[PDB]
Design a binder for this molecule. Structure first.
Ligand SMILES: CCCCCCCCCCCCCCCCCC(=O)OC[C@H](COP(=O)(O)OCCN)OC(=O)CCCCCCCCCCCCCCCCC
Ligand SMILES: CCCCCCCCCCCC(=O)OC[C@H](COP(=O)(O)OCC[N+](C)(C)C)OC(=O)CCCCCCCCCCC
Ligand SMILES: CCCCCCCCCCCC(=O)OC[C@H](COP(=O)(O)OCC[N+](C)(C)C)OC(=O)CCCCCCCCCCC
Lengths: 55, 70
């Protein structure tokens, strides 16, 4: 009896999957972003002068 | 990827701003031996490096000689 939301508001979010449709929408935002992948062996990740490799 | 010459292997990986063809003569390496064509990784071929011991054996067996009594 101390829930601020009315019964219909709590059930409209529940039946219409409020947060799931948002969750899909955020994932779809990434679809229109630049990916991170680099095309090794045609490109190389960063190296620094302190790097340890072959002796 | 082993076909990339060592000088440019560093530039390609965003490790340096000066390409090895724009090097200052006071920053090039000085090699007192002839430098040949780049050799890629030779594994899965006949050119694969073979390790061996660079040290001689530590005991030298007697070189036998026979001497005859008087
Ligand atoms: C494709 C198929 C069709 C899809 C669409 C379907 C549409 C039909 C949906 C069915 C329900 C529609 C009617 C919704 C309104 C009635 C429910 C309601 O009024 O809320 C429940 C009510 C309690 O009131 P309450 O919201 O909890 O007040 C809290 C205040 N903080 O409870 C009550 O006290 C009275 C309840 C009403 C009595 C008749 C039911
Ligand atoms: C129209 C057809 C497409 C969408 C179909 C699904 C509708 C879902 C929302 C209704 C449920 C609900 O509960 O809606 C209400 C909810 C939650 O509101 P709250 O948290 O109380 O808001 C806080 C207080 N405000 C009201 C002042 C802001 O809003 C949402 O989460 C909206 C989600 C919108 C993004 C998802 C839509 C895009 C999906 C892919 C479309 C191609
Ligand atoms: C009158 C209008 C009719 C509308 C009909 C639509 C109803 C749909 C289901 C609503 C009920 C619900 O989401 O329920 C949630 C149920 C069970 O939840 P529970 O165990 O009861 O706990 C929660 C409720 N409490 C606390 C009140 C008890 O599990 C789930 O999370 C199911 C999530 C399924 C998501 C699948 C992906 C969606 C793909 C489609 C969009 C791309």
């Amino acid at each position: 009896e101390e829930s601020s939301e009315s019964a219909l508001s709590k059930a409209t979010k529940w039946y219409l999957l409020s947060e799931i449709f948002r969750g899909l929408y955020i994932t779809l935002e990434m679809y229109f972003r630049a990916p991170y992948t680099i095309y090794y062996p045609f490109e190389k990740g960063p190296v620094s002068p302190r790097f340890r490799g072959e002796h | 990827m082993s076909e990339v010459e060592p000088g440019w292997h560093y530039w390609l990986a965003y490790g340096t701003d000066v390409p090895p063809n724009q090097l200052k003569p006071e920053e090039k390496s000085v090699r007192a031996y002839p430098v040949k064509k780049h050799v890629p990784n030779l594994t899965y071929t006949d050119g694969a490096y073979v390790p061996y011991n660079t040290a001689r054996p530590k005991c030298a067996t007697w070189d036998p000689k026979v001497t005859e009594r008087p």
